[PDB]
Write a protein that binds this ligand. Structure first.
Ligand code: HEC
Ligand code: HEC
Lengths: 104, 104
């Protein structure tokens, strides 16, 4: 994969709620440093909600791929609400941009 | 409705297949200039497939909003494939970025 494009994807779609760097802060979501090979729900200092902890799954390329591919199946209600809030704002911003750009 | 954020979303999520500018090129998808207030399937010069045309739907703020919220209502199988191909590439670039950034 192209890490430079992946960086832009991460900024746009995740960085509002997650940091990746060693010792980076917990925000809406947990810091993700050390994620690869860690069991779900094991970021130190982050208060997970009921669903995430009870998996027994190890994060890696393949589990991330399945996670991202059908998030609704696996994300808990809390994150679903936060994500839906961000997606509603993104839609309104996109439509705002389109009504400007396509009529300029 | 933040037009500048809307632009960034458009670049990331749509600009591979769409232009918005007057006289802008048709690419995988139709140029979008003048979209608002136009019926579905009426971009001049563009070769559509069946499942979009002859709707009688007029594009606007609300129909665009529903499109983004419920794409199954509007996107044909052809576009589903193009978008699914794109999302897979996105997932691989994001995962590649994460395996670098979360291990730095
Ligand atoms: C962009 C595509 C991403 C990616 C790759 C991830 N997120 Fe999130 N995340 C958020 C919250 C509140 C949680 C915890 C939910 C709970 O309490 O159980 C998470 C959790 C994750 C994980 C699991 C981490 C673990 O340590 O087990 C992963 C891998 C993850 N996220 C990746 C919050 C958000 C958002 C808030 C609106 C947004 C946007 C994202 N996350 C985006 C992404
Ligand atoms: C980013 C979220 C967007 C937005 C806002 C739109 N698209 Fe696409 N698009 C693609 C193709 C092949 C078509 C034609 C499908 C067919 O033959 O019917 C479209 C169509 C649209 C429309 C309808 C346009 C019309 O004139 O009726 C609209 C409003 C629209 N798009 C907006 C192809 C793609 C992609 C290829 C992988 C990508 C990505 C997008 N479109 C993204 C977006």
């Amino acid at each position: 994969g192209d890490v430079e494009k992946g960086k832009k994807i991460f900024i746009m779609k995740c960085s509002q709620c997650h940091t990746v760097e060693k010792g980076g802060k917990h925000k809406t979501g947990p810091n993700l440093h050390g994620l690869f090979g860690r069991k779900t729900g094991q970021a130190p200092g982050y208060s997970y909600t009921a669903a995430n902890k009870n998996k027994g799954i190890i994060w890696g390329e393949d589990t991330l791929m399945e996670y991202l591919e059908n998030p609704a199946k696996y994300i808990p209600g809390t994150k679903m609400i936060f994500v839906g809030i961000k997606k509603k704002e993104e839609r309104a911003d996109l439509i705002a941009y389109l009504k400007k750009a396509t009529n300029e």
